[PDB]
Copies of this chain bind each other. A is one copy, B any other.
Amino acid sequence: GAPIHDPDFIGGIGKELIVDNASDVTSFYPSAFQEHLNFIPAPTTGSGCTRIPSFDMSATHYCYTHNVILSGCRDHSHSHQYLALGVLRTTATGRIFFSTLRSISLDDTQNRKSCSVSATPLGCDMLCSKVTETEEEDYNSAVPTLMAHGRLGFDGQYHEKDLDVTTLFEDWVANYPGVGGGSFIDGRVWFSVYGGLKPNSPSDTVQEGKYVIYKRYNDTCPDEQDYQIRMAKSSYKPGRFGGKRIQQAILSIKVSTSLGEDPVLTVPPNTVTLMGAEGRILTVGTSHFLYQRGSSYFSPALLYPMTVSNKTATLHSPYTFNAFTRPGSIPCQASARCPNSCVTGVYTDPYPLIFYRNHTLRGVFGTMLDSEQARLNPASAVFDSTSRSRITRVSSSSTKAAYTTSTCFKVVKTNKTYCLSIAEISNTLFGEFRIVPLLVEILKNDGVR
């Protein structure tokens, strides 16, 4: 009942779970979906949905949030944001369960969207955008998107303060949290953000001519160099949003009793980051990572190493997991290998699981959508730079998915590793999308070699 993970988990949260230098990475694999957790509420109505999940867990507690629609699941409809603070516990038999300490349903008149959450010492910090217009309409409006920093504390109270986006995002026409969780580092909470830049603004101008090409493993693009460069450059300005540059950014905010205190926006050079997209900032062991959704031409899961310098951050060449692809519209489908202009893909994050002894990330766990173009066929597996382990299908090849966010941990008492995969899924005819949490133990076949 204590407001902290039960003793069995103490010391098994947020660290490098598996450190192997010999044993092959893909030798580890997910077992069957165990104890179907019930900490995530079902939709309030039978005709509504729960969508856009965000999750983050510290050494003492976890934070979770999702958006609820009462009728249908159309983005152009009123919504309510559900937010919860909880901890990991075990029953007398050892059964793992996520216990909620506090939760709140923000049912006011504000229209919060694309919210990300982070577990901080003060509770559960949330970054949301507040809008009344459509996304395409947002990028059409020169002014930035309103954003707010909120927090559900251990005392159950929720507080929030709107950020001064006029100045904070002066060079932006649209800006949203990346949905994936944020991370607490050196007294500040760090959230991945993305949106569009005001053409010719100081921020835009500094990105002119900047781009980067990430190639697939053992599958080079046939297009001529001059062509790829031309297309790579154009990937930052897709036709979907009228040519505005879609930019990746990182927002850090001081964690204290004053919400929204001293926000600082960092915009990495596009010679490192690809087109802006939904994302997540996470800390595993002593390393920090920024996951970026493959909304552009690059299909394999990206994990940009992230370093912190006071109130700002720096991203380095990303880790890539070639087999951990995502579905997308042509010419940016899962098998794509050439630079192109598109706004597709889906959020399916990879969680750092296996590392070398020198702390270099080697393998990750995640629930990919095993499909070429359509958003369907969710499947959990362990991935390394080029391969995929034995998989565990979430349901059927028909199952539709919109988001999957995974976080792994260890039960020190039994020394077993588990991975939680939260997925917004739906069946061809069982209603709208709804968020479902799944747990799997990470196994290792020894009778193999």
Which A residues form the contact surface with B (CB < 8 A)? 36, 41-48, 50, 394-396, 398, 425-431, 434, 436
Most chain B CB within a 10 A radius of its CB, from A41, A45, A427, A428: A427
A89 to chain B, nearest CB (A): 21
A319 to B311, CA, bound (A): 80
Contact of A434 among B394, B396, B428, B431 (CB under 8 A): B431
Q: A395-B427, A395-B429, A431-B434 are in contact. List 9 more A-B contacts (CB 8 A).
A: A41-B47, A42-B46, A44-B45, A46-B48, A394-B429, A425-B430, A426-B430, A430-B434, A430-B436
Q: How many copies does the complex hold?
A: 2
Q: Which residues does chain B contribute within 8 Å of A431, judged by CB atoms?
A: 42, 430-431, 434
A184 to B426, CA, bound (A): 40
A198 to B436, CA, bound (A): 48
Identify the 8 closest CB pairs spanning chains A and B, nearest first: A43-B46, A42-B46, A430-B430, A42-B47, A429-B436, A396-B396, A427-B430, A427-B427
16 CB < 8 A contacts A-B: A41-B46, A42-B45, A43-B46, A44-B45, A45-B46, A46-B50, A394-B429, A395-B398, A395-B429, A396-B396, A425-B429, A426-B430, A427-B427, A427-B430, A430-B434, A431-B431
A398 to B429, CA, bound (A): 13
A44 to B394, CA, bound (A): 26
Contact of A46 among B396, B425, B428, B434 (CB under 8 A): B434
A401 to chain B, nearest CB (A): 11
Q: Which residues does chain B contribute within 8 Å of A436, judged by CB atoms?
A: 429-430
Chain B residue nearest in CB terms to A438: B429
Chain B residue nearest in CB terms to A33: B429
Q: Which residues does chain B contribute within 8 Å of A434, judged by CB atoms?
A: 46, 430-431
A322 to B430, CA, bound (A): 31
Q: Which residues does chain B contribute within 8 Å of A426, judged by CB atoms?
A: 430
Q: Which residues does chain B contribute within 8 Å of A45, judged by CB atoms?
A: 42, 44-46
A421 to chain B, nearest CB (A): 12
A259 to chain B, nearest CB (A): 31
Q: Which residues does chain B contribute within 8 Å of A394, judged by CB atoms?
A: 429
A428 to B426, CA, bound (A): 11
A81 to chain B, nearest CB (A): 16
Contact of A428 among B42, B43, B48, B395 (CB under 8 A): B395
Chain B residue nearest in CB terms to A68: B46
Q: Which residues does chain B contribute within 8 Å of A46, judged by CB atoms?
A: 41-46, 48, 50, 434
Q: Which residues does chain B contribute within 8 Å of A429, judged by CB atoms?
A: 36, 394-395, 425, 436
A43 to chain B, nearest CB (A): 3
Q: Which residues does chain B contribute within 8 Å of A427, judged by CB atoms?
A: 395, 427, 430
